[PDB]
Amino acid sequence: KETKAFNLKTAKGEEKIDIPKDPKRIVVMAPTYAGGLKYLDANIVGVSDQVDQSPVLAKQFKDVDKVGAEDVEKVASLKPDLIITYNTDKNTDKLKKIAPTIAFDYAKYNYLEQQEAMGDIVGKSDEVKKWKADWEKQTAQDSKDIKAHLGDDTSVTIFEDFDKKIYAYGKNWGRGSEVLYQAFGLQMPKALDDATKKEGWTEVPKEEVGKYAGDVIITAKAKDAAQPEFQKTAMWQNLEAVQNKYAFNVDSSVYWYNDPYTLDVIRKDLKKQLLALPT
C-alpha cells in the first residue's frame, strides 16, 4: 500500500518514519494519543486498556478491542498497519517487527502540536485546523471571563493526590495544565515553574506543598479517595489560596489526558469552578 513519511520530533531532531498514507488498522498503545485519533475518526482496531480508566475516553472506545500494556501478542493478533506508543515502551523493537511504529517522545509536542500530528497521521489536517481555530476562539473568551472575575495576574497550582504521593505539573502534562496555563493563560508560580521545567512535572514532598502554592490551588484526586492528607495541615489552612477559598478538587481520572474530548470536558468544568469562586 501507498506510504508517506511521518516526521517524528525526537531528541536527535526529526526521525522519518514510513507509515501508510491511509492507515486502515491502527493500534494505539499510548493512551495520550487515543482521544485525538478517535476525534478524527481514525481507523483504530486496538487501544490501550488504560482508556477505560477515564470516564471520558471509556465511552468513546466501547466497541474497540482493549490491549494490555505489554501484550505484544495481542497487538500482533490485530494485524495492525500502524502502531502508536511512547518511546518509554520497553517493547518498541518487538512492535516494529509487527508494523510501522511511532513511539512518541511525548514531551516534544505541546497539546495543539500533538493534535496536529494526529491530523498528519490520518490525513485530516483540515479538520484539525478547524478544531484548533474553534478551540482558540472559545478559550480566548473563557480567559477574559475568568480573569475579569479573579484578576488578570491570577496564578494557579495543580497538585495530584496519587498512590499516597503528591505531584505538581508544568504547563503541558495533563491534569488541566494545558487548559489553565496555555488556553486560559493563567500564571504559574515561579517556584513551581522552576521545579517542573526540566521534566514537565515533579513529585512534591508533603512538607513542601506551600513552597509551590499560587493564588488558586486545584487538587486532582480520585472520586473514591478520602481527603488527601496534605489538605489537613496547619500549613495548608494558612495558604492564601485556602484562606481566600480559592481551592477545589477535580476528578483525576477525567483530567489526566489532553486530547480534544478531555479538553472539552475539563475546559467546561474548570471554567465553571473558577467562576464559582470563592467556595
Interacting residue ranges for Cl ion, rule: CB under 5 A: 1-2, 5, 16, 18, 21-22, 205-206
Q: Are residues 3 and 21 in contact, defined by beta-carbon separation less than 8 angstroms?
A: yes
- Please report how close the Cβ of residue 193 comes to Cl ion at its closest, in angstroms: 13
Choose between 120 and 269: whose C-beta lies nearer to Cl ion.
Answer: 120
Length of the chain as a residue count: 279
Please say whether the beta carbons of 40 and 122 come within 8 A.
Answer: yes
In whole angstroms, how close is the CB of 9 to Cl ion at the nearest point? Answer: 15
Which cell numbers hold the place of 9? 520530533
For the CA atoms of 213, 217, 223, 224, the dihedral, rounded to the nearest 10 degrees, stands at: 40
Residue placing its CB nearer to Cl ion in the complex, 35 or 100: 100
245: left (phi over 0), alpha (psi -120 to 50) or beta: left
Nearer to Cl ion, 56 or 117 (CB): 117
What phi and psi values does residue 178 have, to the nearest 5 degrees?
-65, -45
Task: Name the amino acid, one letter, at 239.
Answer: L
Nearer to Cl ion, 152 or 203 (CB): 203
Rounded-to-integer distance, Cα 246 and Cα 274, Å? 8
Closest residue to Cl ion in the complex (CB): 16
By beta-carbon proximity to Cl ion, the closer residue of 236 and 257 is: 236
* Least distance between Cl ion and beta carbon 189 (Å): 13
Q: What is the closest distance, in whole angstroms, from the C-beta atom of residue 212 to Cl ion in the complex?
A: 8
Residue 93, amino acid:
D
CB of 26 to Cl ion, least distance (A): 14
